[PDB]
Symmetry: C2
Subunit: 414 residues, 2 copies
């Protein structure tokens, strides 16, 4: 069980072995309550099991994308901050810690993709996607390219696709309409078409993945890449002279990257919910607290307005927050399995010419809107089985059972 009259906190070692602990000591000095920071292996996988039995930590620190499942299982306590504390943090950050219109965590830090550029090759990076083709033709004459980033993962390609109207699941009044999918609207098609045209006119290659793009940028072969703050320290050691800025606009509208929010959740089984609220609101989420943590390991852009104004004096942190403000918060709902599955396939097919942009995104619309996570797992399981089979496996099947038609086709490529 969880012991009364103390605080046990779980956070990943990569957020700082000393920082949060120092805030803990300050809390203990004022209140006499002992704060203990632990870093157990796979704590994101451990917490849901331990907490389901009424054990585990009082507080858990993790990216908001796991907090949806925890909230669904009734493992997180509903938090009760007043409009005053809430005004101290950026309004959007609160959207990452709402589940069925209920606040279930405190937002700490904000993370998102920015345009990373090589200042020696390109002192003035382009404001628009539209002017990249021209820039690439010019750079190709010097044996360089304009832009390389991961085309294989939707996380990276979505910002362009979403610029003119694309969305995953409609977010309005603190609620996700899981039936309102925005994968095959005019805007989605316009964006993916521009991406495919970049590949057709050989400004980009559909094969380019994360590691290939990182190699290219860090060797000074490409003037720009699209990546997050996790990629900065590799560039630092590379001694490429880099800047981080706002993502290019498409059709006059900003690229909309998905936003991840490091959050602090209170265990529903914790007998110390009031101590947790006191610690998180009045010791951690202050200039003094976030400074203690940041001095240990930098948080990047933070939810707390007062301290973000300080950190944003680093223009790379300012870039991260601007791109996050203009982006969309990544849905923490089960249907994102279907979204990722659908869109990953759709962009690989559109980039390879296997499907037209229209065909690809129409299919992805259907999949994202109508495939449960278990259905995705079943379909993928079948696909793996067949694809990994060495024999000449071919299928041309159409079966209709119980008012439902299922087709399966397996054949070599053309």
């Amino acid at each position: 069980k969880i012991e009364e009259g103390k605080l046990v906190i779980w956070i990943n070692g990569d957020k700082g072995y000393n920082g949060l602990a120092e805030v803990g000591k300050k809390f203990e000095k004022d209140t006499g309550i002992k704060v203990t920071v632990e870093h157990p292996d796979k704590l994101e996988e451990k917490f849901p099991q331990v907490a389901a039995t009424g054990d585990g930590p009082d507080i858990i620190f993790w990216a908001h994308d796991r907090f949806g499942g925890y909230a669904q299982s009734g493992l997180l306590a509903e938090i009760t901050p007043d409009k005053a504390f809430q005004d101290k943090l950026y309004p959007f950050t609160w959207d990452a810690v709402r589940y069925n219109g209920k606040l279930i965590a405190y937002p700490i830090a904000v993370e998102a993709l920015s345009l990373i550029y090589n200042k020696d090759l390109l002192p003035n990076p382009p404001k628009t996607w539209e002017e990249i083709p021209a820039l690439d033709k010019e750079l190709k004459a010097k044996g360089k390219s304009a832009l390389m980033f991961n085309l294989q993962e939707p996380y990276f390609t979505w910002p362009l696709i979403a610029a003119d109207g694309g969305y995953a699941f409609k977010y309005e009044n603190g609620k996700y309409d899981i039936k309102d999918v925005g994968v095959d609207n005019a805007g989605a098609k316009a964006g993916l078409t521009f991406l495919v045209d970049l590949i057709k006119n050989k400004h980009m290659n559909a094969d380019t993945d994360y590691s290939i793009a990182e190699a290219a940028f860090n060797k000074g072969e490409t003037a720009m890449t699209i990546n997050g703050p996790w990629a900065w320290s590799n560039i630092d050691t590379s001694k490429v002279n880099y800047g981080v800025t706002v993502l290019p606009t498409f059709k006059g509208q900003p690229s909309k990257p998905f936003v991840g929010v490091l959050s602090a959740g209170i265990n529903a089984a914790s007998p110390n919910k009031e101590l947790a609220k006191e610690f998180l609101e009045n010791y951690l989420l202050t200039d003094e607290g976030l400074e203690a943590v940041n001095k240990d390991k930098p948080l990047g852009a933070v939810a707390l307005k007062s301290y973000e104004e300080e950190l944003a004096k680093d223009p790379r942190i300012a870039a991260t927050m601007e791109n996050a403000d203009k982006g969309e918060i990544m849905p923490n709902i089960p249907q994102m399995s279907a979204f990722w599955y659908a869109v990953r396939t759709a962009v690989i097919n559109a980039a390879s010419g296997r499907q037209t942009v229209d065909e690809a995104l129409a299919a992805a619309q259907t999949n994202a809107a109508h495939m449960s996570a278990v259905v995705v797992d079943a379909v993928e399981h079948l696909v793996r089985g067949i694809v990994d089979n060495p024999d000449d496996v071919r299928v041309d099947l159409i079966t209709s059972r119980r008012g439902r038609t299922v087709e399966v086709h397996v054949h070599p490529d053309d």
Copy 2:
């Protein structure tokens, strides 16, 4: 171990508790060698397990369709009948008991579908499929139908489909070419088209299954049906005065039903292979032997020429044998799973209008030729998962990996 100096025989109870035993007694009377006829449950599943460890019976009686798998596992001894003994049996029966051009069993009896007709409704049954629509129009005026049989199972529909051309797997020596499938030739398409047209002009219902057909014929509601010797006794107890005759021709060519051949295999681990050969050749496969068995439970049409001529005095048995001669021996290989799956689906889709005959049989060709039993099981598993799901599940997926394209589609009908 299998005991030397005596015979243990396994056969299903339904082939007679006394008949084969009687031939065993005669063998014992002449030779002094004890023959024991046993009837264990699921002996077709038991034999492969026990014989793999060098145990089980000296001789096993079963349909040849399981003898392919036994022969593959090296569980059946090569039999050594001379050309003289082989000429005593119908040539085509030998093809059912060959594996890699090696004889692995003695053929006993032959079974196949025939045209069963109600003599009071139809004293003169039709020689051709072509004349059935007109015959139905006439019988419909008297509140009756011409023909009802199981359309759900390919066992029953294939005879018409294969009439003009079409085969499951190609066979040479005792070998079936698993890549050479004959499902989507013009002959198969012409036959399935005639079946679909019967359904379209409402001479038959696409829903009609085994029990529905049996009910209809045994209640005198339909003049004809297509069925095997297993179905005869239920008609005997029914009000219906029936005959069994040759199946109708399509485009002047006989319907080609699949043939099942009850066969006698000698266990490869038997120390009594010579006693077994003596018993099977010179006691069982004789007029006297097959008589002892038949008087217990009928064998139907038999492989032995001399005794088939006697049994064929019954026109129903004559019919079974003629439709077997004109049919094709059922392949005894594991790929028949893929064949049945492909063709079951193809005929349901063609009969229901989901697919054209052409598309249905082209698809069935691909499936039968290139779906392992593993692949069929994986596909089928997914399909059940999805179809049974209450939510509004829809999929429009095309993925390509490692030079292979996979499509999956789920939508309402």
